[PDB]
Amino acid sequence: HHHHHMMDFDFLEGKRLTEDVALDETMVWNEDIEMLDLHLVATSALIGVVHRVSYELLSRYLPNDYTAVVVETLARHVKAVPTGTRVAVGVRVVGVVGNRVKFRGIVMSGDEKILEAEFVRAIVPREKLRRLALE
Amino acid sequence: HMMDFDFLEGKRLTEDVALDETMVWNEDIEMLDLHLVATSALIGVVHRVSYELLSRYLPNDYTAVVVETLARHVKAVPTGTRVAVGVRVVGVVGNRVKFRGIVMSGDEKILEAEFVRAIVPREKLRRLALE
Ligand SMILES: CC(C)(COP(=O)(O)OP(=O)(O)OC[C@H]1O[C@@H](n2cnc3c(N)ncnc32)[C@H](O)[C@H]1OP(=O)(O)O)[C@@H](O)C(=O)NCCC(=O)NCCSC(=O)CC(=O)O
Ligand SMILES: CC(C)(COP(=O)(O)OP(=O)(O)OC[C@H]1O[C@@H](n2cnc3c(N)ncnc32)[C@H](O)[C@H]1OP(=O)(O)O)[C@@H](O)C(=O)NCCC(=O)NCCSC(=O)CC(=O)O
């Protein structure tokens, strides 16, 4: 009877958001000790950044009992950028298939493309995710 | 700078890794009590194991950076948990080394990944990024 989730999420198609995001010291690539003084941003950290903008975008539009979690992601990190920098981060909803929302993401530093991504959030009732996490 | 890295093919490494507080998913204030591990954090964990594997076999003036990554995050897992992280070199083309990675929590798959490192001289990077 808590089996009352049947939406068409296509209302999300075409939504977009761009934000300026600070690349801070928690985001540094630190695998290689000899490269530390460059403090390049880590690929995973940039992926984190792009994902988080997609949540900010969705949260305005998700019905009240539903959250959205990343289930799939693809990224190409094409230019190294140092931390301590602000970047422009854009995401747009390029498709919806059931409860799967697909985004394209871009990280620009000035006019240089740093990273591009394509990724998927599953839109799930908080109750259901909580039950799954706890089982 | 002309080397064959084909010899990396089939190399593996597995590591028991703690998921700590710095890796928590916190976008959703109503789910903070579950302290789920973030996707990007888990990708970081998988990438880092591939660097430990490569660093053992690369010449002393060379580094390796991630240029592409793909991941399915199939099961939620809380921080404060230890996971088995395995990576394997499945392919080499020039200075491009493709890995498959897996995160397991016991017998449950949490995440699978496929990603590429480019093997580069540190000086090259240092030249590029200081230009
Ligand atoms: C790695 C790149 C520089 C690669 O750029 P390109 O593809 O244009 O260049 P390339 O890879 O073909 O070649 C660049 C260099 O490779 C070396 N090179 C190429 N082929 C070679 C071979 N067969 N043998 C030996 N050396 C070789 C050359 O010295 C040098 O080229 P030449 O001789 O021509 O100069 C760039 O994609 C980049 O900077 N990406 C950002 C990566 C990043 O910052 N990642 C985050 C860190 S890792 C991380 O953060 C982990 C985490 O997620 O947490
Ligand atoms: C998201 C998942 C639960 C998805 O699992 P499944 O594919 O089995 O489930 P599912 O999506 O098909 O369906 C689950 C639920 O969705 C709801 N549901 C499905 N379709 C629907 C529709 N059309 N309308 C309304 N509701 C719908 C159903 O109520 C319910 O299940 P039913 O009817 O079946 O009972 C799982 O893959 C998972 O936990 N993955 C890990 C995700 C994660 O932890 N990400 C990290 C946080 S985000 C993040 O960390 C950002 C960062 O990277 O930094």
B80 and B99 Cβ atoms separated by less than 8 Å = no
**Cβ atoms of residues B85 and B52 within 8 Å:** no
B19 three-state secondary structure: strand
Binding annotation of A for malonyl-CoA = 7, 43-44, 51, 66, 70, 77-78, 80, 99-100, 128
The sign of the CA dihedral A101, A107, A111, A113 is negative
Please work out, in degrees rounded to the nearest 5, the angle formed at the alpha carbon of residue B18 by the alpha carbons of B116 and B26.
80
CA atoms within 13 A on the CB side of B100: 5
Size of interface A-B (CB pairs under 8 A): 106
Q: What DSSP string describes A50-96?
A: HHHHHHHHHHTTS-TTEEEEEEEEEEEE-S--BSSEEEEEEEEEEEE
Q: How far apart are CA A60 and CA A17, in angstroms?
A: 11
Point out the residue among B51, B73, B125 whose CB comes nearest to the CB of A70.
Answer: B73
Neighbours of A57 (CB within 10 A): 23
Q: Under 8 Å CB-to-CB from A118, ≥6 apart: which residues?
A: A73, A74, A75, A94, A102, A103, A104, A105
Assigned token pair, B88: 């394997």
* Tokens, residue B125: 């990077």
Give Cα separations from A8 to A5, A11, A37, A58, A78 (angstroms). 10, 7, 49, 15, 35
Residue A10's SS3 state is helix
Residues of chain A contacting B126 with CB distance shorter than 8 Å: 35, 38
- Sheet with strand A100-109: strands edge to edge: A16-23, A85-97, A100-109, A112-125, A66-77, B62-73, B108-121, B96-105, B81-93, B12-19
Residue whose structure tokens are 């093919």: B9
Q: In which region does residue A44 sit, left (phi positive, over 0), alpha (psi from -120 to 50) or beta (all else)? A: alpha
Nearest Cα to A101, choosing from A4, A5, A11? A11
CATH number for the domain spanning B59: value is: 3.10.129.10
Domain count, chain A: 1
Per the structure, the complete domain to which residue A46 belongs is given by 1-135
Question: What is the DSSP secondary structure assignment for residue B78, as one 8-state letter?
Answer: B
Tokens representing B78?
């809380």
- Tokens 């070199």 map to which residue? B89
Q: Cα dist. B100→B11, B97, B110 in Å?
A: 11, 10, 14
> How many angstroms separate the CA atoms of A55 and B29, rounded?
12
Lookup: tokens for B75: 């099961």
